[PDB]
Design a protein around this ligand. Sequence first.
Ligand SMILES: Cc1cc2cccc(NCCN(C)C)c2[nH]c1=O
Length: 130
Amino acid sequence: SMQEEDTFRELRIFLRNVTHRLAIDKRFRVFTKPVDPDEVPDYVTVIKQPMDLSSVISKIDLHKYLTVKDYLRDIDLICSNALEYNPDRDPGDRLIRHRACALRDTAYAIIKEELDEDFEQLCEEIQESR
Ligand SMILES: Cc1cc2cccc(NCCN(C)C)c2[nH]c1=O
């Protein structure tokens, strides 16, 4: 229906806003674009499901997220990928892991403060009906 289409449109608007706020944070610059294979050729080898904030925006616009829960799975993926690819004790690796966890924590905190639980439940019930 139109009302359900309106619901998913509000979801996309909400998700773009959250993603924009993550993307403009200087700590998260490394997560804003896909990894350049010329600079890092072994990334595609090690990480089977690459994810970044530009790709999240593309997925929002392609209507790939019908719930905030599905969006958070991609946020979690950005974080888990970073933990996986940068596991060493070296400061470079520890910095990116800390930033990855901060990105995840920040996304969840924004959602906790600004997502109405009943809006998410409506999205989930529309999703499950299809
Ligand atoms: C998303 C991402 C981008 C990136 C770019 C350059 C270099 C690294 N890794 C640091 C090198 N260490 C893994 C040894 C990178 N690690 C990442 O996790």
